[PDB]
Amino acid sequence: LEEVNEREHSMKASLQTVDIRL
Amino acid sequence: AFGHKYSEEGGLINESLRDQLLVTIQKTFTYTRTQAQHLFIILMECMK
């Protein structure tokens, strides 16, 4: 679960940057 | 926090976290581009 949380935080930051790219 | 982990040797912060900082500093903070240039100089001066 700790792995899922850290990785999901990285994914959410990447998703916000992807929204910025659009 | 993010400029402290993604820091390398202190003030040398790359360009992906300048504009990732931007969308959170545009989302949580709602800031611009050029006022963002001043706040990133203050962020690396604080980070220095």
Q: Is A3 on the interface with B (CB under 8 A)?
A: no
* Interchain pair A16, B23: CB under 8 A: yes
Give Cα separations from B8 to A8, A18, A21, B11 (angstroms).
23, 24, 25, 8
- Min Cα separation A7/chain B (Å): 15
Euclidean distance between CA atoms A19 and B45, whole angstroms? 29
Element (H, E) at A3: helix A2-21
Q: Is B20 on the interface with A (CB under 8 A)?
A: yes
Contacts of B32-38 spanning 24+ positions with Cβ under 8 A? none
* Interchain pair A20, B23: CB under 8 A: yes
DSSP code for A1? -
Q: What SS3 class is residue B36? A: helix
Count the Cβ atoms, other than its own, within 10 Å of residue B34: 8
Experimental method: cryo-EM
Resolution in A: 3.6
Q: Is A10 on the interface with B (CB under 8 A)?
A: no
